[PDB]
């Protein structure tokens, strides 16, 4: 109905807190997830005090109407939160307790430089806008922050849910505003990626490499090109389930390296056949004997260099 | 309007009950399903008691307003249920009968270790938050729990729909709460998986193995690599449905084993030709005759071991 | 506001009726469809009786409020109907005319035993719940039941829209309810399925069979395995439409039979080559000549048997 | 709030017009499209006549309430339109000018008999239902019918947007109703289909036909079967971009003809090889040189006949 | 409740301004993106003037009701925005400050002529309609226009967000209207496309070209046709994320040129084999040596010409 009047000069302080109940539906393409949690607020209003002896009660219960409630919004949400008030209580001195359960979809950027073995941080921002007659600042109540024991994401490990206790005050549209930052840290479960993606590609690459122990041109052509087609199919299967990155990643580097190796293998087979046709079998034998050892060693060294470069 | 007054300390007891009508839309990747059921509540309110003889009626009907109604909320739902009140009736002694019809989307984790032949248990949780003046507890009315005989699920068999009688009481956010558990047990129908998945893969594998009765190198290479491409296509088709799992599953183990077998077959085909060209035409014959019997027996033993480990 | 009082015990009778306008969005996977139609109701309420001479009018129009309207609900709908009242009229003797337009999604199971050439029946259930003081029973008004001439379902032929006159009365949750069934019968348009799906598969199978007129092992292997790879794509394309089927269907039987035929053809080619290697060409020639006639005749007989079984 | 008093028992005529603002989301699979436009109405009400000299004002302005406006609805919409009245004005005479802005999703069947080069007409129906005390008929005002210049559809050209002046009066549900038809004619932009679909298929077919200039049986088998596989792979994307509405069409006939040509080419290659084996090379050469000219001529004649038949 | 009365003839002026908070979900196929921003308005209303000295304050606060608010609406939005008022203030002179946070889905065409290396401009249009007694015009307040520092579009770079000062006044439905234009200029991040799309295609094309150093017909046929299949798969992958293009585009021209090159390569291989069969090795060798250099040079020149033509 009206913000509480300042006594002399003090701004109004609202102590916040979020208690997670569920987090689900993490989307890699759209970089969104859905949340479901409690919201708690507490401020000071001297106009709601009462005498317990005359009233005969301890805490009074109000309704959302006929009481002043500060406006709290989330910055990074696609739509306004769907909320319903649970309870409002008033202490004899004037402190008010407010509890509310909501559900919303949050927007948060994701980093995919280390996609198979990466870790992310999800942000939720709370902001309040000062009224004409009063300045409002936010705070953190550590006794109201937590997560449910059964909170789970599909394929992720939840590590912690904390909040930065220092709000950021700045001027926006002729008014002062205060913001809070809630951080959720998670890690990816990478076990299922190994036998599903990594080892089959190695097997296909080795099958392609087995052409260095043969002199039949047609068989080598069949081997290498068919394995290339299989690699293309697997590449689509992999790079169908992640968004368009702006910078270089790890998976892209590995896939490009594999394409390079296939091209070089084709060149080697062509060179061997062309030298054999010109009745120079010794050079062809030397070249294929060298390639047999050259390919795996270079592959291992390049993979080691990339692994150090991205995870070092 | 206001919670009913206690006598000395007796907590308020609310009797619950859910009668399923339609359950459908079970999503494996989203791990959700949609429900449609009745909800029945009953409690005692001495303020509404009346003498039937004076009023001349046995049951009085009230609108949802002007009557205190406990707040019952589901825990694991994406959004608050959309419900409408059907009937409210008041007994002469003050007992109130309540009935509403709702629909909601339920979040429930799933287990995919024994994926083709698994059984699941879907959970539905009720909870009520105690008010400041009065303490509220939940209960189960065993005569108002059931389901329609017309309930159908696409690919599942309904086994039972029960409720755990004893609630769980805990203090959350400085208030006491009570929680109930409703469990729906289902089992998968697995007959259609056999001729659609299992037998075509076995036929493709046998077609691949037929290369041990041939001596031409190009034909063997063609057979093995083309069957590998077919296997890759089938693997993608199968993985279209099953979501990511943080542990080993039966299907993943089988698929990885098949990839390993293809790799070993390619190695054997290469070895035979290399020995043949090296002017040793007897060791090649020995190796081929050995592999003819070695491959099927080892495949059978490995399948038996896997079926023992995962289903025992 | 309050149901009309009975004379002695005679239950209130409500005459129903549905007039279809649009039917669209029939989803096979979800087994749903979307409807848009009218809804006519008519009952008796003697408290609304008036005489025409003193009133000066023949019919009185009422707003939806200030009058008792029974609660009519559909059973198999994802959400309650989105309806808005159109007209309300009152006869001099007490009869009331009701009319409204709605739109909802109807859940209906489907049968895919004869999927290319099947017929389906769709059910819409109407139910009313008795109030504490009066019992309500539904009836059917045949003059207000029908469908529009412009109703269009993509790929389906609408045949009839009728209702079973006798309702089914049962006791649910300590109250009596009456249920009515409206049945929509449709047939599938199968002609487009012939040149899109059926004939190309026969052509590919014949191309595969053409390998019985050649003795080149590599050419036969190429033909048979490449045609198998071609068949797999068609199998995926066909299977990606229908939902999972608990029982055995026509299409699944045909596809499994085709897989078996490909396997037997591979076996025959391998046997021919192995016999030809051992310098016994007479047996190979006899086997090839026998298979040339054996394969098409057995295929035709198996198809005739399957067609007789699944359609008789 | 009542219908205007009847004058000489004459039906009440209203003038209507629609001015398009946005047209978007033309989903051919569901045969729907969303609209966004204005709506103008006008009729006569003697009760609203006011003296301009005494009032001192030119025209009046009324809230939607305390005045009667006829109920106008769209027949082919999924749900009721979302309308918000903009202006209500009444001239010094009895005429009243009405305006509102709405948005809705419209149902309209589409025909794909000439898919690449087809044209469509989209219908929007307006209906008014007579009341128990008056008859209402519709009319079209030419100056209020129009279309915004910025209205765009992805891949379509907009031709015209007119209305049929003549209504359609009929008795439905024992009431008289009038219908107006607003037609929006569009045509598809078909140039991008040539270099994306038409020419690659011709190139692949010619690559297949190149097998009439060689005698190597293995090479011919490889060419023909691999090009068939490529044709299937291309048909995958062709169906990916093609509307998912099964019916008879031009593209389906073209694809079926291509499959038939591939089958005949395989038959010819097999015949040539079989004749060459039996030491009758003259017949094989005659058949080959005849087919070299026979195939393109028959293909061109079949294309001409189909094009004349479907588009003439 | 009533527009402000003019002094003599001055039209009402409303100063506008939009401050972006979040823009996201840029869809190429649907040509849509979602926005979330502030909206600021300011006009003169002398009916609300007061005296600060006698009132004892400096700024009054009002609800959205009991005050006249101009009806500002967007044009190219799928539905009406979801809006909630944040603040309303009144200056003693009469200037009203209005603030509101909204969210909407915007329609805007895109140009795909230079798709890998293109830039786009996104338009937002505001419009107001003059009332029967007053004329309203729009204006731009540059101090209230800006974008948030955390605004991000996945795969795009944001350049600027400005607006045109001059509105476009025109008459629609016999009422004057004023329209503004806010422009958001963005650029595409093209680096990721290089190693994911461009280089693999070059490698596949070179593998195809390697057939000019061999003289085995079967090997050349296998190489060329298998690389063609790989190109078709890559074409499907590229065209997954792209809408229909009314005019010729860069990528379409490149893909068509690649198809043409494959066809010419097949022609060359067939010609070489046919010449070699007729015992004319000299012409075959000359043609092969000529093509070895002819193909890369022509490909490079055609690429340069296309790049100059489209990016001129
Ligand atoms: C080759 C033939 C044998 C193949 C066996 C199948 C592959 C087994 C991979 C096991 C990975 C593992 O230990 O778990 C991954 C696990 C992740 O833990 P979460 O449960 O996701 O937390 O990672 C680890 O910490 C273990 C590190 C494993 C390294 C790789 C092992 C060697 C694999 C190739 C042989
Ligand atoms: C644009 C440029 C790329 C154009 C397409 C290139 C496809 C790959 C070509 C393969 C080359 C094979 C030629 C070959 O075998 O030559 C052997 C040739 C014969 O020489 P003499 O013994 O005197 O006879 O000797 C060699 O081995 C020379 C080295 C050739 C292989 C290394 C060069 C590869 C260049 C690829 C560039 C791609 C970027
Ligand atoms: C990582 C590297 C991946 C490399 C992929 C190709 C693997 C090798 C393919 C098979 C090569 C066979 C060579 C061969 O036959 O040599 C003959 C060779 C030696 O006999 P002599 O000539 O008297 O000496 O005999 C044999 O083949 C005996 C068996 C040895 C090879 C079999 C085991 C290889 C297993 C590789 C697993 C890699 C993971
Ligand atoms: C080879 C030459 C034949 C190629 C075309 C075979 C299919 C033609 C079917 C046309 C008749 C369909 C028809 O009349 O449908 C209506 C009617 C409706 O049945 P109810 O009344 O519900 O009993 O359908 C039938 O009678 C069903 C008849 C089933 C047997 C014929 C269809 C066989 C189709 C598969 C043939 C083999 C395909 C192999 C590759 C796939
Ligand atoms: C598990 C079982 C499947 C494992 C993989 C199966 C590979 C396919 C079988 C290949 C059989 C080839 C037989 C061959 O080449 O020799 C023919 C052989 C040699 O003749 P003789 O010298 O007189 O002795 O004689 C024959 O014709 C026997 C025919 C046996 C094969 C036919 C039955 C196939 C059985 C498949 C099992 C699954 C069903
Ligand atoms: C060799 C030729 C290669 C280019 C073929 C297309 C060039 C002609 C395009 C012009 C079409 C045109 O005029 O369209 C408008 C006009 C509209 O007429 P209505 O108003 O309905 O009377 O359309 C027509 O008249 C169309 C007439 C038939 C066009 C046939 C075009 C070629 C069709 C494909 C032939 C080859 C098929 C190859 C395989 C395709 C696999 C999908
Ligand atoms: C049941 C229907 C499907 C049956 C299986 C079809 C497989 C493909 C058939 C291929 C036949 C090729 C045989 C061949 O070349 O024989 C040549 C043969 C040998 O001549 P003579 O020395 O007199 O003996 O003569 C010919 O050229 C036969 C001419 C007919 C071949 C064309 C028609 C093939 C059948 C089409 C069926 C379509 C359905
Ligand atoms: C080896 C050959 C080169 C391989 C790398 C290809 C990319 C080279 C260009 C990278 C830099 C792009 C750049 O400057 O973009 C900005 C700039 C934007 O200009 P506006 O502001 O519109 O004026 O873009 C340009 O100027 C583009 C100039 C033409 C670039 C041509 C790049 C090569 C094209 C592909 C050739 C081979 C095609 C192979 C198959 C591709 C299948 C999709
Ligand atoms: C409809 C048109 C499409 C028809 C299908 C395309 C078939 C593919 C053409 C293959 C031609 C191969 C024939 C060949 O090499 O002949 C060589 C032939 C033999 O000459 P002599 O020794 O005197 O006898 O001489 C030549 O080189 C002829 C010229 C061949 C190159 C030009 C062909 C181009 C055809 C383009 C048609 C499609 C557009
Ligand atoms: Cl919010
Ligand atoms: Cl809830
Ligand atoms: Cl309903
Ligand atoms: Cl409507
Ligand atoms: Cl708007």
Numbering used by the authors:
A (entry chain C), B (entry chain D), C (entry chain E), D (entry chain A), E (entry chain B): 5 to 316
Quote the study's own text:
Gloeobacter violaceus proton-gated ion channel (GLIC), a prokaryotic model of pLGICs, is particularly well-suited to stabilize preactive states under suboptimal activating conditions modulated by pH. The GLIC homomer consists of five subunits, each with an ECD and TMD. GLIC is activated by the protonation of a series of titratable residues in the ECD, leading to counterclockwise rotation and contraction of the ECD. Therefore, we established a data processing strategy involving symmetry expansion, backtracking particles, supervised particle reorientation, and 3D reconstruction to resolve high-resolution maps of various asymmetric intermediate states of nanodisc-reconstituted GLIC at pH 4.0, which provide comprehensive understanding of activation mechanism of GLIC.
To explore this, we prepared a nanodisc-embedded GLIC-Y251A mutant at pH 2.5 for cryo-EM analysis. Although only a homopentameric configuration was previously resolved at this pH for the WT, focused classification of GLIC-Y251A mutant unexpectedly revealed that 44% of the subunits adopt the o conformation, while the remaining subunits adopt the i conformation. Interestingly, only 2.2% of the population adopt the o5 state whereas 11.3% of the population adopt i1o4 state. Particles corresponding to i1o4 state were reconstructed to a map with nominal resolution of 2.87 Å, with clear densities across all regions. Comparison of the atomic model of GLIC-Y251A i1o4 built into the cryo-EM map with GLIC-WT i1o4 shows similar conformation with backbone RMSDCα of 0.40 Å and similar pore profile. Therefore, the functional profile of GLIC-Y251A i1o4 should resemble the GLIC-WT i1o4 which is partially conductive. The pronounced reduction of the o5 state in Y251A, even at pH 2.5, compared to WT at pH 4.0, indicates a drastic shift in activation equilibrium. This suggests that Y251 is essential for stabilizing the outward conformation of the M2–M3 loop in coordination with the outward displacement of F116. Our cryo-EM data yielded unexpected results with 86.5% nonconductive channels, 11.3% partially conductive channels and only 2.2% conductive channels, which suggests that the Y251A mutation reduces the channel conductivity significantly. These findings suggest that Y251 plays a crucial role in gating by stabilizing the outward M2–M3 loop conformation (o).
